């Protein structure tokens, strides 16, 4: 199952 | 910008038997960046119908791909993998050597 | 006994200002089970193993939404990193991301990962504590300060210790026949006369799973590295792996040399010797 939150560098 | 030259191996899925259907494999690994040109050759000419794995990478971030095609080896027919990459001044040909 | 689930994401801006490539691949151990590739015109997260095809439409809709969301954040990241390193749009740049979890023999959380590379080198990595970051360079410290202030590690910790491991267990149970198997290496030795003076002994391992294997040469029971050759473990293309180790030996000294094979599929480590 993929990660469900959005992270940005 | 770190660049790494591909390691190339050409081999069959199964031990080669003349007249018996098999898969010709060309495995490229340890390369960066990901854009790479891989051809399977039969008697020096590009095989047009060739499949490949989904691009992935190792702990060191270096990429690996498998190019493959169904094929029937014979005594006389020669096979090779031709690889071009930014790290190479010319495309590298590795011949299929069945008897390793 | 011990297992891992891993997602691997490659984001490539190509020369100029075209749309970047995005590819996502999911693995359980050494078995790919999902893919999405912009170069293959993917519109959905696609199965790559029959056991994951059994998941229903809500699974596939959700994974498709999330992988498209990942594609979007990588598209931002490419622009962000051009800015951080003062690079023009004209060049080709590569972002890689890997996240996942390992479980031990008891199937409990052992370890979590969440890390990036830029242009073939470390950028930033979640440390083992799942609370702190390793910024590889000055530019990555900007990312580290941002992710600390936003408590990103704490959100990742919830997924890596919970969801990631809960779903890895589900897959291991649903894909049991495929994922919880070991295929022992089929081993043999070849002999090729290099000259009148030397012979190559090649020790072969075929059709094994998982990929993890050790091939070592001994000479009269002592570890032997000199005049040895070891190729990368390679895929057969049917879900099994291959590997060989070779040594060049003086003519008439073949019998001193043993190849040692270790694989979790074997009852016991194997010893091969060249035989007339």
Of residues B35, B2, B38, the one with CA closest to residue C13 = B35
Q: Which domain holds residue B88?
A: 7-96
Residues written for chain C: 276
C:188-247 residues touching chain A, CB 8 A cutoff: none
Cα–Cα dist C184/C212, whole Å: 11
Q: Distances in Å between the alpha carbon of C152 and those of C61, C98, C171?
A: 25, 15, 26
Count of the separate structural domains present in chain B? 1
User: Does an interface of 3+ CB pairs under 8 Å exist between C and A?
Assistant: yes
Answer whether C241's CB lies under 8 Å from C211's CB. Answer: yes
Q: How was this structure determined?
A: X-ray
Q: Which residues, 6+ apart, have CB-to-CB distance to B70 below 8 Å?
A: B21, B22, B23
Return the CATH number at B53: 2.60.40.10
Beta pairing class for B79-84 and B92-95: antiparallel
From the list C48, C192, C231, the residue facing B9 with the nearest CB is C231
- Do the domain assignments include residue B12? yes
All domains of chain C in start order, with CATH = 3-180 (3.30.500.10), 186-273 (2.60.40.10)
Q: What angle do CA C184, C201, C209 make, to 5 degrees?
A: 15
* B48: number of Cβ within 10 Å: 8
Q: Report the residue of chain A nearest C84, measured CA to CA.
A: A9
C134: DSSP letter: E
Element (H, E) at B98: none
What is the DSSP secondary-structure string of C35-89? EEEGGGT--S-EESSHHHHTS-HHHHHHHHHHHHHHHHHHHHHHHHHHHHTT--T
Alpha-carbon gap, residue B64 to B52, rounded angstroms: 11
Please report, in angstroms and rounded to a whole number, the separation of the first and last CA atoms in chain B: 37
CB C190 within 8 A of CB C245: no
Query: Distance, in angstroms, between A8 CA and closest chain C CA?
Result: 6
Alpha-carbon span B64 to C25, nearest angstrom: 13
| Residue bearing tokens 């990429």 | B63
Tell me if B2 is assigned to some domain. no
Return the residue in C9, C10, C45, C230 with the most chain B beta carbons within 10 A, the one to mutate for interface testing: C10
Name the residue among B30, B61, B100 with its Cβ closest to that of C244.
B100
Residue B1 within any structural domain of the chain:
no
Chain B contact for C233, CB < 8 A? no
Coil, strand or helix: which one is C29?
Answer: coil
Q: Resolution, rounded to a tenth of an Å?
A: 1.9
Domain for residue B18, yes or no? yes
């Amino acid at each position: 199952l993929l990660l469900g939150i959005g992270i940005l560098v | 910008m770190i660049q790494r030259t591909p390691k190339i191996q050409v081999y069959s899925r199964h031990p080669a038997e003349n007249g018996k259907s098999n898969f010709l494999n060309c495995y490229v690994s340890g390369f960066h960046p990901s854009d790479i040109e891989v051809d399977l050759l039969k008697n020096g000419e590009r095989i047009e119908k060739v499949e490949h794995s989904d691009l992935s990478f190792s702990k060191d971030w270096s990429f690996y791909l498998l190019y493959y095609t169904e094929f029937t080896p014979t005594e006389k027919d020669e096979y090779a993998c031709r690889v071009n990459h930014v790290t190479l001044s010319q495309p590298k040909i590795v011949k299929w050597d069945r008897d390793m | 006994g011990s297992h891992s689930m891993r997602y691997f994401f490659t984001s490539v801006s190509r020369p100029g200002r075209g749309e970047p490539r995005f590819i996502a691949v999911g693995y359980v151990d050494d078995t790919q089970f999902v893919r999405f590739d912009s170069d293959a015109a993917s519109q959905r997260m696609e199965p790559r193993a029959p056991w994951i095809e059994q998941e229903g439409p809500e699974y596939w809709d959700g994974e498709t939404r999330k992988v498209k969301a990942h594609s979007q954040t990588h598209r931002v990241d490419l622009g962000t990193l051009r800015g951080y390193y003062n690079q023009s749009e004209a060049g080709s740049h590569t972002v890689q991301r890997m996240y996942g979890c390992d479980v031990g023999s008891d199937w409990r959380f052992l370890r979590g990962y969440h890390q990036y590379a830029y242009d073939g080198k470390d950028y930033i990595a979640l440390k083992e504590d799942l609370r702190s970051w390793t910024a590889a360079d000055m530019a990555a410290q900007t990312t580290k300060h941002k992710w600390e202030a936003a408590h990103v590690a704490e959100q990742l910790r919830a997924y890596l210790e919970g969801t990631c491991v809960e779903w890895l267990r589900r897959y291991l149970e649903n894909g049991k026949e495929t994922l919880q198997r070991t295929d022992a290496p089929k081993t043999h030795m070849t002999h090729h006369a290099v000259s009148d003076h030397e012979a190559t002994l090649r020790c072969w391992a075929l059709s094994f799973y998982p990929a993890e294997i050790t091939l070592t040469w001994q000479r009269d029971g002592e570890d032997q590295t000199q005049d040895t050759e070891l190729v990368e473990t390679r895929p057969a293309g049917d879900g099994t792996f291959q590997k060989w180790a070779a040594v060049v030996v003086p003519s008439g000294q073949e019998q001193r040399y043993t190849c040692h094979v270790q694989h979790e599929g074997l009852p016991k480590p194997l010893t091969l010797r060249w035989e007339p």
